[PDB]
Design an enzyme around this catalytic site. Sequence first.
Site, PDB file in Angstrom:
ATOM      1  N   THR A 147      10.383  -2.094   1.641  1.00 22.02           N
ATOM      2  CA  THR A 147      10.910  -3.415   1.324  1.00 22.02           C
ATOM      3  C   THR A 147      10.160  -4.495   2.100  1.00 22.02           C
ATOM      4  OG1 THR A 147      13.131  -2.498   0.923  1.00 22.02           O
ATOM      5  CG2 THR A 147      12.972  -4.874   1.248  1.00 22.02           C
TER       6      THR A 147
ATOM      7  N   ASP B 164       9.893  -8.236  -2.682  1.00 24.34           N
ATOM      8  CA  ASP B 164       9.230  -7.326  -3.602  1.00 24.34           C
ATOM      9  C   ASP B 164      10.270  -6.674  -4.511  1.00 24.34           C
ATOM     10  OD1 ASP B 164      10.222  -5.628  -1.431  1.00 24.34           O
ATOM     11  OD2 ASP B 164       9.082  -4.029  -2.414  1.00 24.34           O
TER      12      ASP B 164
ATOM     13  N   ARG C  54      10.491  -2.986  -5.239  1.00 24.66           N
ATOM     14  CA  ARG C  54      10.218  -1.558  -5.126  1.00 24.66           C
ATOM     15  C   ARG C  54      11.240  -0.924  -4.199  1.00 24.66           C
ATOM     16  NH1 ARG C  54       4.546   0.948  -2.895  1.00 24.66           N
ATOM     17  NH2 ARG C  54       3.838   0.541  -5.032  1.00 24.66           N
TER      18      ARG C  54
ATOM     19  N   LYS D 152      16.068  -7.321  -5.273  1.00 23.47           N
ATOM     20  CA  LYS D 152      16.618  -7.288  -3.927  1.00 23.47           C
ATOM     21  C   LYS D 152      17.201  -8.624  -3.492  1.00 23.47           C
ATOM     22  CE  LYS D 152      13.265  -3.760  -2.572  1.00 23.47           C
ATOM     23  NZ  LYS D 152      12.026  -3.468  -1.800  1.00 23.47           N
TER      24      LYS D 152
ATOM     25  N   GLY E  99      16.620  -1.972   4.251  1.00 26.97           N
ATOM     26  CA  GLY E  99      17.255  -0.830   4.879  1.00 26.97           C
ATOM     27  C   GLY E  99      18.001   0.020   3.873  1.00 26.97           C
TER      28      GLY E  99
ATOM     29  N   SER F 205       9.977  -3.210   5.623  1.00 22.71           N
ATOM     30  CA  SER F 205       8.856  -2.386   6.066  1.00 22.71           C
ATOM     31  C   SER F 205       7.580  -3.212   6.189  1.00 22.71           C
ATOM     32  CB  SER F 205       8.654  -1.214   5.104  1.00 22.71           C
ATOM     33  OG  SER F 205       8.434  -1.670   3.782  1.00 22.71           O
TER      34      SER F 205
ATOM     35  N   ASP G 200       1.393  -2.556   2.550  1.00 25.62           N
ATOM     36  CA  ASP G 200       2.474  -1.674   2.971  1.00 25.62           C
ATOM     37  C   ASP G 200       2.796  -0.690   1.856  1.00 25.62           C
ATOM     38  OD1 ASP G 200       4.774  -0.971   4.877  1.00 25.62           O
ATOM     39  OD2 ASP G 200       5.872  -1.485   3.045  1.00 25.62           O
TER      40      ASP G 200
ATOM     41  N   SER H 242       6.502  -1.288  -0.003  1.00 23.73           N
ATOM     42  CA  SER H 242       6.663  -2.447  -0.863  1.00 23.73           C
ATOM     43  C   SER H 242       5.601  -2.429  -1.952  1.00 23.73           C
ATOM     44  CB  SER H 242       6.564  -3.745  -0.063  1.00 23.73           C
ATOM     45  OG  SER H 242       7.345  -3.668   1.116  1.00 23.73           O
TER      46      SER H 242
HETATM   47 MG   LIG Z   1       2.767  -1.037  -1.260  1.00 20.81          MG
END
Ligand SMILES: [Mg+2]
Lengths: 204, 196, 196, 242, 222, 249, 244, 241, 231
Positions: free
Chosen positions: E1, E17, E19, E33, E47, E129, E166, E169
Amino acid sequence: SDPSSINGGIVVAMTGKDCVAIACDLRLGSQSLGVSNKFEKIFHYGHVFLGITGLATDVTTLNEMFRYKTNLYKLKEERAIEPETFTQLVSSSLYERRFGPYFVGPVVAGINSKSGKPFIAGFDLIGCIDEAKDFIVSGTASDQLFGMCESLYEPNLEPEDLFETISQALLNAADRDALSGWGAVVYIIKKDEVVKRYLKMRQD
Amino acid sequence: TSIMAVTFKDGVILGADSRTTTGAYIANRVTDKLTRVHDKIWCCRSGSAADTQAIADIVQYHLELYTSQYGTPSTETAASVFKELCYENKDNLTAGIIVAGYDDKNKGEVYTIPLGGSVHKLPYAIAGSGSTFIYGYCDKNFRENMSKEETVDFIKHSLSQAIKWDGSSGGVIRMVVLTAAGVERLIFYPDEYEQL
Amino acid sequence: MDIILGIRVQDSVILASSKAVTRGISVLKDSDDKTRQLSPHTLMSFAGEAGDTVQFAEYIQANIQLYSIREDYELSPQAVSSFVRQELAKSIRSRRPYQVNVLIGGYDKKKNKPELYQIDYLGTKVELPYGAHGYSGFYTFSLLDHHYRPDMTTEEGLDLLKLCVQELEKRMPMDFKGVIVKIVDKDGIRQVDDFQ
Amino acid sequence: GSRRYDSRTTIFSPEGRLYQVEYALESISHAGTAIGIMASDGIVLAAERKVTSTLLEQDTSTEKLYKLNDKIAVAVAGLTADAEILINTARIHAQNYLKTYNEDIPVEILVRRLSDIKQGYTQHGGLRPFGVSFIYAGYDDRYGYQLYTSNPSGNYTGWKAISVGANTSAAQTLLQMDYKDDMKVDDAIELALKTLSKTTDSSALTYDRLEFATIRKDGEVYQKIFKPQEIKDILVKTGITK
Amino acid sequence: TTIVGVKFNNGVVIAADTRSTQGPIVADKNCAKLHRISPKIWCAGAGTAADTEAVTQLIGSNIELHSLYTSREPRVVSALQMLKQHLFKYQGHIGAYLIVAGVDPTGSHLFSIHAHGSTDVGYYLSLGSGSLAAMAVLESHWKQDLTKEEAIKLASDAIQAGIWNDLGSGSNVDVCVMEIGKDAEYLRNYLTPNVREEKQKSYKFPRGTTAVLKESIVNICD
Amino acid sequence: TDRYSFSLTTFSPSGKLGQIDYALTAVKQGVTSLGIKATNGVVIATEKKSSSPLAMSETLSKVSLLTPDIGAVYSGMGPDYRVLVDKSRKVAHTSYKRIYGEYPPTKLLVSEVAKIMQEATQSGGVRPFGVSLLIAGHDEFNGFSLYQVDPSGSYFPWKATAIGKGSVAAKTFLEKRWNDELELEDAIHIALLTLKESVEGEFNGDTIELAIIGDENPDLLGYTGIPTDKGPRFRKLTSQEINDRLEAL
Amino acid sequence: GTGYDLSNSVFSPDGRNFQVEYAVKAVENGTTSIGIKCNDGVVFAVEKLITSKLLVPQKNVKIQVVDRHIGCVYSGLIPDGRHLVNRGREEAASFKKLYKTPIPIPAFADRLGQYVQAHTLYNSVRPFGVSTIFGGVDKNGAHLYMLEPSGSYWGYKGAATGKGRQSAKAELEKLVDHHPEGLSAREAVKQAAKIIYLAHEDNKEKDFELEISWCSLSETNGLHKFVKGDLLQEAIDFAQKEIN
Amino acid sequence: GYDRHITIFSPEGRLYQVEYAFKATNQTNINSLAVRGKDCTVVISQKKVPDKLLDPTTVSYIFCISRTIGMVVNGPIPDARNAALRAKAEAAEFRYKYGYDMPCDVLAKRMANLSQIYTQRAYMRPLGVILTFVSVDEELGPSIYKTDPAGYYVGYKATATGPKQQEITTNLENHFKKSKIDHINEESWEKVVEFAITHMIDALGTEFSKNDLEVGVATKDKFFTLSAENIEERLVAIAEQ
Amino acid sequence: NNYDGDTVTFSPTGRLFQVEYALEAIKQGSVTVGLRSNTHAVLVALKRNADELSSYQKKIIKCDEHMGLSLAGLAPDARVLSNYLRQQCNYSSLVFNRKLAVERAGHLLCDKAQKNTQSYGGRPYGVGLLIIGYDKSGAHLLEFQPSGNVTELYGTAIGARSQGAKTYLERTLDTFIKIDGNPDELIKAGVEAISQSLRDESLTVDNLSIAIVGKDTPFTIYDGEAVAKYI
Ligand SMILES: [Mg+2]
Ligand SMILES: [Mg+2]
Ligand SMILES: [Mg+2]
Ligand SMILES: [Mg+2]
């Protein structure tokens, strides 16, 4: 000894053109030992279907609890519960036991009787709603089902093609999982007709 | 975290840094660690951010009710509320508090409540990680009844040294001056205190 | 361990339970009857931790007899199995779960059908043509998969159970001191007196 | 203290009756008449609405006939709110029985549970009883079709044809005159309609002033709560209207 | 996230994002989200997604009841205090990390709340993240003034840094702008840079490929 | 200590419940409030009788939103109505929205408030509510609906009805002027004409409070972006709109 | 209607609670107790009825102490006074436990007043049958308060309750008029002795023992102490001389 | 009989205990009015110290609920202090739970809901007091909200409460009909205090000294009560007219 | 008349009629006298029987080695109060290694009795107590009434016809207050006092009960022949 990995089982739901499909495997076992070849994991309330994979006792308790709740809902509201409302109900019921959770991965599938939109959804142990319009997988072979559904799925499928797609997905995912298989059931759900089909699998 | 509170002739001055880290990552570099629980009663917080925030909120509530019923509370009263909250819940709290207050009766006062919930009234108090590195400097440089300028300079030098040596402390240096005039807010930026 | 086997044979349900009660390196009993008659047409065999087995079985028996007295009507084996499964699914999430596994064999007079249910200490209920609890299954299941016929007679079921017990006495690392066998059919529940 | 204001609802009379129970019976005696008839192949419930007006929406209205589960219905006479409270409790108990035994609850068990609740309300707690009488119409595979009746006292009785509410005497007289054991569901419908038309206090029996329900037999049992148009059709068929 | 929040001259914007992953497997490739506490008070979660959804829905219901009781527009500080106290009561056992932004009669506000009950204030915040990448972008490109379009571009670029650098995400970018006076603008899939490439072949099977043992029509009727 | 653990509402020897009838009598002396159901919405209106003219009439709203699609008006004791609307708003969340993700339908919220009132007429040491409620709502599967809830805990669906002082006359007027082909504007007009007879003082947008459950208002959502969320159907008519509809009578 | 005086907390048609007035009647039948607020502190005095010489003199103390700085005397049902004093001691202990500082006199007054008012709120509890004169010295100086069975309390320059309360009040008013500058601690003790000796005339059938305490910043360092020994005899002699 | 002892319905649909509590509100025989200015709110009440033995500084029917909300009570001082303590606790709890100062109307609604509870529950009696909360709400400006033992609450442009309340009410109604505004077009709170005192003198027909009045002023983020000397200075400034 | 239904109702004159009815229950109880000097304290009890075949019940109860009481009125209420006093003395001795003072015992029984004269349902106690003790302050005699009023006295008497014994103790005050070091003379003075309340009765070995406490004499009860020498 993981509760969601003791009995095994797989459920997969997919959406097509004005239809849905929900399939499950028929195996109930205790680790390596296979016990029941006829343990279905899909139960319907009115016109909304729910596949529960995980700890078998929690599967049965959730089935009975949701039957309870949907019967009282129909008695009070005088109408059958819709798939979206039932999804929210499953989420709330799962989260009500946040710190004493059920070890299950429920999947809701249906067609809204008023709008005709196909609706499927998935949850975790505590009721995290995963609203995906394509496919929803759950069980011990969740990764195999994910790969098969991501490789095979194409939007707007007729029921005769959606059945073949979901059946091939579940079969090829179950043949690569030890705790899944021993038979399979697929529901092809339309607005006015729901067809139940028993598949042929390898019994190992 | 590096926090302190120093009394002086005209009142009291609280000082702190602004670095809140989750491990080695600076989660926030503009943190206000100086919290107001009453008009002229503030506190420097160190330790668990959640624990200190909740304790400060409850102390502010109790002091507001106290002011509503029996009038303005003393600094010792706020220290006692902090001590009760931290001692009766010592098993589930990691909070070091420095309560600094100003009243016309006792001028400026500083109490410190470390782990365990003991209360200690001191002429000046330091707490947090960086405080470990300034005990000598503060003990060799602190004086009673200093002026406002000398107190600000002392706090600035101490907190700058703490930030220089403590990795857990950094950011800007925040100060709250409690005097008869009232509440004054001061900020000192890195480019200033780093060359000290 | 404990040997708990059951087999449904067209006209009746046959339940076999080991006769040995062993605590440590001593076989305390060689004639134990590990079954409780829940209703005139519903029997339940049990196996598990000491004390939990008999306590749970007699509790279920008292409840089923209370229902039969209140309604003047014998509950179907399906309803009895559902009640037992509900109790066991309440047990696991209690303070001290009942560590009992049960095999419920009953002749439904309404449907005129023999039924065999297997429930574990977790509340996993399954209707099976033949069932076994514990390591006994690892030897009996395949044997039945090869020799079981749905159109079998009570005598054929007795022969099949004799074969299962012989295989268990051969390959199991434990002397369960024989099996007590009971038959549940339209005429009620009886015990086989003469067995190998 | 508070004893000066306590009415003492759960006390006996010198004759051996409960004051509040008799007073709740007297209250129910002024409610709309409800009639249940159990024929050889079904059960029929019919009731008259007390709350009647031209501006009363009768389509979405439910004040006399309620569903307990898929196989049992109740005709109410008295306080509708107490009736709905007891109906909610009965639905919950039926679903508890279903979850426990995975079978539909028999009619007599639910009737006795509701009657024991109403009884306990008249023995302890110091609360007034529920001023509601119930006619239970149900089906199960043990006793078949069943008609029960319960009053605020907590007692329940089994019947072939019964009536509760207002004008129960004349309704019972008409039923005892015109009831036969071997009659069918349509004959029971006709008899209930005739008894309601003969025991009503209004001029004529119109569709908007009554509720109707049938529990009948595809090998499965169906429970039909009549809609106003179907009630008007059965009225023009029976001859009460034209 | 990866979630971010940026205050500009006349309001605040949040971005996230789309995902949601269960371990290394992507569960939802387009999970919204951005949740709504109040019509002008939004929050992005990170989380345990179940904990975030539940706590946001609970605090939103309480906010609605409080607004109906007090007959006033809900304040961001109210939802902030309620989330803070509810999370602190559970000592972080509710794994919800939120970035809560909004506008109220007092002005525009942006805060961050952690699972244990800690709160932080700032003009730009990042959580999840990919938070470190987004925060890098923010520290490199944030200024005071900031127009609405400037803040939207900044938040979108931060979420993109989290989507690309990342592994937790990815996919699309949801945005929600909240200006002082105007209604909240909820741009779902404001950017979609990860459209799946078309497959080389279609894997539709010829009807009759799957062997069926038994078939029946189930009754969804009454 | 609550030593009143016994019912304060008991059956009289005649069969009457004294406190129920006395609460109904207290309701009958309340200000007249009416409701009319049309084919595309419902209207609920009442008179804003102010004790002192120094009091701000806007701070005394007799119509209260229960859910974004369900509103309520009353006749009887103001404070009881206020605590009832608070309880109804709370139960709309604690018993439905927090369980099904959606607001409750009209009949279910009416049944919940009726259950509250029935508990108030049977629990220990409590008097019944001295209010009659008119609940106007719209749900997706039942359309528009208007319900009346009495202190006894009974509720009835109404095509149109009034409660209060001139309730009898107002109901007669409605029975003479109501038809199943009415529009929301026609219903508002009939409601204004009916309230004109029950009042004698000033009859303007500042003395009468009227609200409607009609179409969805996307302008009152506070946010734009979700196409599924249209908007709230409840809307309180402003004083200007009431005056504009009164000037054309 | 009738019967409005049978239960507590029942409003009569004239807006009164007759049970509180009956508690006041019970108070009026009690002994005389007075309080005088001087410049640096407060003084409390009470008359103890010696029904027989079998009573041990100087024992059977009626004036109670709360914390270390609060003095409390009461007229009416002595057990109700002890109950109220115990509740006040609990309140002061809680206040000291939470806010460290000893409880201020106004805070203690409000605690006792809320307790009595709550006791006049329910028909399941009887109103207090005591009128309480209490006070002491805090950071804001000396304070004297009187609290009625109704829960109504006020701050007084001088307070008096009991049978001879009227006479005492008159004397107290003289003390306010003749001494606008204020009395000292021992001066207030002697004048309280005089007032109690004059108030006993309404109960001359029995003899009385005078009991005096004081809480003064200068004479007792802000602590409540019983005036005993030489000063008590001095005040008794002053009272017997000022009387005829 | 017993229907006039507890809070239950009489055959006429009336609650006699509530009406008797309304009667008890006038037991103190003190009148108090409240008016709003451009950015402040003034309450004035009669200060009657009948006994010479009383401390006049302790005789007060105005309470500082919070830093922004003040409350003047008409009724017995036991119930007055009870309601004051409850309102202070409710304001503190509100500020703690919701992170912002409790609004005036919200506190009025809370106290009125508690009054409704006392009216519907038979175990406790209604508080025979009338509470007038005054503040300068951050979203509503100067605000006056009054609650009564019946559970009713409503806001006012101005209000009056007491035995002679109707005369002051009529005076304020006439002044506001003439001025055609809903407040006092004065910038300083001192002039609004003077206006209130002057209009109370005109309505009641009696002069007041500095020891006969209690004045509570609410401005932006501050509620205070005037001392005897500030009241005396306002009376001198009224005498200058 | 209309105000004696419970302890929660005050009379128009300000009376508590249930408390007065408990006092009257005491007045119908058998007489018991108590006295003390500067070194000892004696309780004399006229035990009452139902008939010649019955026993004379028991009026003296020991609460601790330094404190005891005599009852007059309802015996079960006296048992309850004596059990509370035993528990309080035991708590003091255990937690503080401190013998409970007599004044504090009177205060605790005063509070225990007052807790019933204000709550509905809980009647007042129907017994009166005479508590003797010897502590660090010397000898102590207390009279406890169910109204809550506890009075410290040199001598007193409670029960039927107790006024004669009370007047006798009033006349003999200067005599019995100086009986120090000789417990037998103090006991005989108490016996004379309790004899002053005998209209048609006479002291025997079955109706007389004695209790003594002092400096080097723990609270001891004498029944039967042990009291004969004092008859
Ligand atoms: Mg990614
Ligand atoms: Mg496999
Ligand atoms: Mg295999
Ligand atoms: Mg550093």
